[PDB]
Structure formats: structure tokens, C-alpha cells
């Protein structure tokens, strides 16, 4: 079984969010579980520079101009790169320019991604051809469309990491992407009178997965599907929709071995976490106090993630004696809002606007609670990281958050399954109740410790995930 992942990011080479973490860890897990998995990425600068053994496989002309297909390895996994400098040789985000504007040629940049994914199924690489093309999110959404147009020389799965990103392009671009014009149909990649790459992936794939069992349910609903629910309901009925929960990469996210930490620690030596908290408080200008709960945010600052709710609840949190350590970027209103709170409440509110990989680890290893009040959450990796680091996740019950966190209810505590705090509704009052629950648990140190150790006992294994994907690939 040979599988090609088609995607736009991969940790540690290029990352804007959780998708990169997944691509950086799944393929190796699949190889251990007996599937020959390879990865296809655009040759973005940071990616090309990481793959130092990359060699030329072939050269082609395409509707978007020439590509050189390269192939190398990273961390033992086979990596293909689409070198097409006129499309991909630009710094920063795969998706937008430095002024945050989508590239005007995005339609070509990502259509080509899909095209090369499909072409691989027809011998683009004379030495290796995938049995399954595994496309991720809209970026790779055309892979299954090109495959369908070519008579399906390989089977395909399309994995939804997030349905809110639809890859919408004007219909006239049908002229530019070398697909049958008959594909521009509601039974095809048309969506509200435009081309949707997401629609294309959902429609043409042999099978669709989502990154958690609950999200796979949710996206058959209008409030999570944003118009796509009819296709997904039909695919569910056809048995062509399923959920497979993400793992966590233990090479990167383990307090036991995390080299980015002032102090490493384990489920049975949580006293060794204290130094991380102390240094986190110092680094952020917080009062150095071990009697007070430190709440953490590592997140995009947006409504999708519920960070407006955090801002609204902040006074309530401060009033009860908690601290906040926040790292993130997003809505300028929220950025400014949080900077204002840090200025207004120095010593209890520490804020850092921007993206900092290493600092996220120091927050994860030092905070007591991580706030993940997502409005929707296909998976929510930061919360799985919280569990592993014994920093209790405080989450809204939606998507993967609902699959993985157990509220500190009486029965969960009694059954020894409690592992964090869960609230229900997307408002500050609802959030504030969970926050109060955390203060109540904090006032009982031995119960807190009990819950920390259960949080750290939870396991999210990529090789277990690989086994589900394998079963799926063989059913296709
Ligand atoms: N400002 C930031 N600094 C460092 N890492 C961040 C920042 N914002 C998000 N991340 C990281 O991005 C990933 C987000 O994954 P996840 O929580 O599943 O959300 P999503 O898939 O929507 O990006 C996590 O690794 C998280 O730690
Ligand atoms: O907004 S864009 O469509 O231009 C950019 C992408 O959709 C960015 N992503 C990456 C993957 N995501 C979810 C999986 O981590 C968030 C959307
Ligand atoms: O965060 C970026 C945005 O992405 C999507 O468009 C969501 O619909 C929105 O809620 C979110 O804030």
C-alpha cells in the first residue's frame, strides 16, 4: 500500500497551524504501521531549504507553467517538492502576501498542487506511483478532481481539517485549470456560483475523513458545514464519510523530553514543573506566585477560536486571582484589546502578539490551565498538548474538544476520568462558569494533582491513527 499525502505545510519545515503538526508526524507513523507513505508539498523557500538531499525526478509543463518535481527525505520520510519558483518562491505564508492579501494567482498555485498529486498516480515519478492520493484541506482539493477526470488511476481520500476554508475562486478560472467544463456543476466543484476547491475535494474523493469523530458528525449540520451539508449528508449515507482522531507528536510535545523547557517533568514528578511556571511568570512580567493559577492562551486571536470570549471574561478571571499568559495573533481588535489588558493589569496579565514556536512550549510547560474556548474545533491540538503537559485544558464542548476532554464532574472524578474543564455555550458567562470550576479545583491541591495525572495518562497516538487510515485505504 503506497500513499501520497498532498498538502501545503509540514512541521518543522513550514507551519502556520495544526495541519503542519499532522503532516510532520502521520506519514512516519504510517510507515511503522506498514504503509509506504510519502508527502507532496509546494517548494516554498523554508521547505526547499530543509530537504537537503532533494534530487530531480522529472520536469513538466502544466496549465500553470513548468514544474521540476524534486524528491528527498526529511526525518526518514520521502518528500516530493513542486519546484515552480514563479508560483512558490516567495517568503512567508503559503496563502497570502506580507500585507495579508491572498495571492492573486492562488487559484493556480493550489490547482497545480492538486494536479501534481493526481499526475503522480499516472507515473510522473517513473520509480513510484501511489495507490491512494490522500489530499488535505482545500489547498489539495483539486487532486481528486484531476483523478476523476483521468479515469481514477488511483483511489483518493480527502481529509477535512477545517471546513470554514472553502478555496473559493471565480468561475471563469475554469478556463485556467485544465478541468472539464462539465465539472462546473452543483454535482461537481461549483458552490454558490463559484469554483470551490473544498467542494471539489468533498465531491470527487472516493472517501472523506475529518480530523475527529465529532467533527465528522458536525459537518453534516448547517451550522458547521456553511452550505456543504447536503453533500456530506449524502456521503454519510453512502458510507463515504468518517472521523479519525489526530495523534500528538511525542518527539516534539512531551514534557518528559522537551528540550525547550527550563525543566523537564513527568506524570509522577509534577513538582519539576514548578520551575517552568516560575520562569514563565518572570518572562511575561507576572508576579512570581505559586499560589495563584496561571491560565494560558496559545492561539489565533479570532472568533473561530473564541478569544473574544476570553477578553470579555478576563476581568472575572483576574478578580478571582488568576493570571493570564497569552501568545497569539489575529483580529487587530483582539490584539489591541489584550495589549490594553496587559498595560492595565501588569503583573497579572502577560501578552505577546505574534507567532513564536519555542515560546508556545514554555507556556505549555509552565501554565496551569490552557484556554481553548473554540466556537468550532475540528480537532484542537493545543488542548491535546495541554493534557500531555498536565496543563488542564478548559474547552467548549464542540468538535474534537468534545471527543478528548472529560469535565471535572462528580461522576468523572469518581470514575477517575476527569481531565479538564468543559463549558457548553459560546458566551462569556458560560466560559466564566468553567473558569470558576477551575478556581474551585485549584483550592483542592490533591484533587488538582489527581486530575493532572489523569490528563497526562490520556494517549493520542499517530500509530493508532495510522491503523484506522490503513483500514480505510484497504476498503477503497
Ligand atoms: N501564536 C502562536 N505561536 C506558536 N504556535 C501557535 C500560535 N498559534 C497557534 N499555534 C500552534 O498552531 C497549532 C494549532 O493547532 P490547532 O490547535 O489544532 O488549531 P488549527 O488546526 O486551527 O491551526 C498548535 O501547534 C499551536 O500550538
Ligand atoms: O485562509 S486561506 O484559505 O487563505 C488559508 C488556509 O485555509 C489556512 N489554513 C491552514 C489549515 N487550517 C486548519 C488545519 O490546521 C486552517 C486554515
Ligand atoms: O479565524 C479566521 C476565520 O476563518 C473562518 O472564515 C471562520 O468562519 C471565522 O470565524 C474565523 O475567525
Swiss-Prot record:
GO MF annotation terms: alpha-1,4-glucan glucosyltransferase (ADP-glucose donor) activity; alpha-1,4-glucan glucosyltransferase (UDP-glucose donor) activity
SUPFAM superfamilies, A to Z: UDP-Glycosyltransferase/glycogen phosphorylase (SSF53756)
Source species, domain of life: Bacteria
Keywords: Glycogen biosynthesis, Glycosyltransferase, Transferase
Annotated catalysed reactions: [(1->4)-alpha-D-glucosyl](n) + ADP-alpha-D-glucose = [(1->4)-alpha-D-glucosyl](n+1) + ADP + H(+)
EC number: 2.4.1.21
Any Gene Ontology CC annotation: cytosol
Amino-acid positions noted as binding ADP-alpha-D-glucose in the UniProt annotation, renumbered to this chain: 15
Keyword field contains Glycosyltransferase: yes
Pathway: Glycan biosynthesis; glycogen biosynthesis
Biological processes, Gene Ontology terms: DNA damage response; glycogen biosynthetic process
Transmembrane spans: none
Gene3D superfamilies linked: Glycogen Phosphorylase B (3.40.50.2000)
Class of enzymatic activity (EC top level): transferase
Keyword Zinc: no
NCBIfam families according to UniProt: glgA, PRK00654.1-2
Functional description taken from the UniProt entry: Synthesizes alpha-1,4-glucan chains using ADP-glucose.
PANTHER family named among the record's database cross-references: ALPHA AMYLASE DOMAIN-CONTAINING PROTEIN, GRANULE-BOUND STARCH SYNTHASE 1, CHLOROPLASTIC/AMYLOPLASTIC
Family (UniProt): Belongs to the glycosyltransferase 1 family. Bacterial/plant glycogen synthase subfamily.
Name of the protein: Glycogen synthase
Encoding gene, per UniProt annotation: glgA
